[PDB]
């Protein structure tokens, strides 16, 4: 990447995305990426707690993780 940027080619850098950690960011309810995973999926088994519906933490926690101004699960 140094030799590409120095030789005037920032586009030829090898940029590998952290897709596993981006997906773990998505399984907590981060809509920053296009991954409708567990808590990112609003009517999922994990989000709803189907028999119980007692996750009373879910709306408050997704108000904070989607809030892109705190440090909780940075992009």
């Amino acid at each position: 990447n140094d030799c590409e940027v120095a030789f005037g080619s920032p586009d030829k850098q090898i940029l590998v995305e952290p897709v596993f950690a981006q997906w773990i960011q998505a399984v907590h309810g981060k809509a920053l990426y296009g991954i409708s995973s567990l808590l990112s999926n609003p009517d999922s088994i994990a989000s709803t707690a189907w028999p119980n519906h007692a996750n009373v933490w879910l709306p408050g926690w997704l108000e904070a993780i989607n809030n892109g101004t705190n440090s909780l699960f940075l992009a």
Binding site: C3, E4, A6, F7, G8, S9, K12
Partner: protein, 381 residues
């Protein structure tokens, strides 16, 4: 044969190349671990450990010196060839204030030709900071063909230097009595290497460099300048530039030296046009130090009675023959030091490395403040 000092053995064999560690007795054992690989290059040149005779070591050192000179001539050939093929020397010769010296172009490979910067004049290359262009301008070069000729001459000298090192070891190597002739060596190096070398360079300056630089400072274009041999050939052209060349080499023998005071100047400043030292003042310097070094080369007794013996001068520098406050060095003084310095190569190398490094530092401190080449001080890189 001419001095009856050679007849060296060590026949040029090829088989002795596929047996690394042949020089050391434990290095030619059989590797075993990896430390042997690193030990091979840790004392490869240490000829003192290999054998025990001083004469064989001296012969090896002499031929190694020749091979080193060959390597340096190959490097010089490469620098002159780079200035003669991959350089903007002619462009810089035209405008040496707006053109950036460059003697290296990069091949168009991966991202790689970005290092070829615009050097002025449409030349896409790398800006060299070695001072080769400023040196060639002061020596008298105007076109690249002269640089190519110098490159070919240096390559020929390199081949000649690798033949002199093979002939002075594998054919006719000197005896140890020849190496221990420090009187003769000092006489010749002081009078023939330094003295005659600076005398020959003063001749070059007076007949090639001073003409070319005078016309260059006047304003003449580099290929409008006559070639150096015309400056040597006809004295009318050279007397247009200097009016002291009309009396030829007559005022020198009749000791009328102030006649020559227009190309042997003693100004002592910087040329306002170029920025370098006064070229006439440089030529006068080389004439004076040639006369000094040649005269210094007649100091040591060699085969004719007159001279000094360094052994006598060393052995007499001792109490009570010293200055009274310098008399703390005792009644032996420097008595055993002539036998230290004529039997130890390491003692000589220690002194010569100290003086060579100190002199390189002196060179560094004298060439920023007295810039000795044209358009050198303004190229700050």
């Amino acid at each position: 044969a001419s001095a009856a000092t050679e007849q060296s053995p060590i026949p040029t064999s090829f088989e002795r190349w596929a047996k690394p560690g042949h020089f050391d007795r434990t290095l030619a054992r059989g590797p075993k671990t990896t430390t042997w690989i690193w030990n091979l290059h840790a004392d490869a040149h240490d000829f003192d450990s290999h054998t025990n005779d001083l004469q064989d070591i001296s012969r090896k050192i002499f031929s190694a010196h020749f091979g080193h000179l060959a390597v340096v001539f190959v490097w010089l050939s490469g620098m002159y060839f780079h200035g003669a093929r991959f350089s903007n020397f002619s462009s810089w010769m035209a405008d040496p204030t707006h053109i950036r010296p460059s003697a290296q172009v990069v091949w168009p490979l991966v991202g790689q030709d970005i290092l070829n910067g615009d050097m002025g004049g449409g030349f896409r290359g790398i800006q060299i900071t070695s001072g080769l262009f400023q040196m060639w301008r002061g020596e008298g070069f105007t076109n690249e063909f002269q640089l190519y000729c110098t490159a070919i001459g240096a390559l020929v000298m390199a081949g000649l230097m690798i033949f002199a090192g093979w002939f002075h070891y594998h054919v006719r190597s000197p005896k140890l009595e020849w190496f221990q002739n420090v009187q003769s060596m000092l006489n010749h190096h002081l009078a023939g290497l330094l003295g005659l070398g600076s005398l020959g360079w003063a001749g070059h300056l007076i007949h090639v460099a001073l003409p070319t630089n005078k016309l260059l400072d006047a304003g003449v274009a580099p290929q409008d300048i006559p070639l150096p041999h015309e400056f040597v050939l006809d004295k009318a052209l050279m007397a247009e530039l200097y009016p002291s060349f009309a009396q030829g080499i007559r005022p020198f023998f009749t000791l009328n030296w102030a006649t020559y005071s227009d190309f042997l100047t003693f100004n002592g400043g910087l040329n306002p046009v170029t920025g370098g030292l006064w070229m006439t003042d440089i030529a006068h310097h080389h004439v004076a130090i040639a006369v000094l070094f040649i005269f210094a080369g007649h100091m040591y007794r060699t085969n004719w009675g007159i001279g000094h013996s360094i052994r006598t001068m060393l052995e007499d520098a001792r109490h009570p023959k010293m200055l009274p406050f310098l008399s703390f060095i005792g009644p032996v003084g420097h008595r055993g030091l002539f036998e230290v310095l004529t039997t130890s190569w390491h003692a000589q190398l220690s002194i010569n490395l100290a003086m060579m490094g100190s002199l390189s530092i002196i060179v560094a401190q004298h060439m920023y403040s007295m810039p000795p080449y044209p358009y050198l001080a303004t190229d700050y890189g």
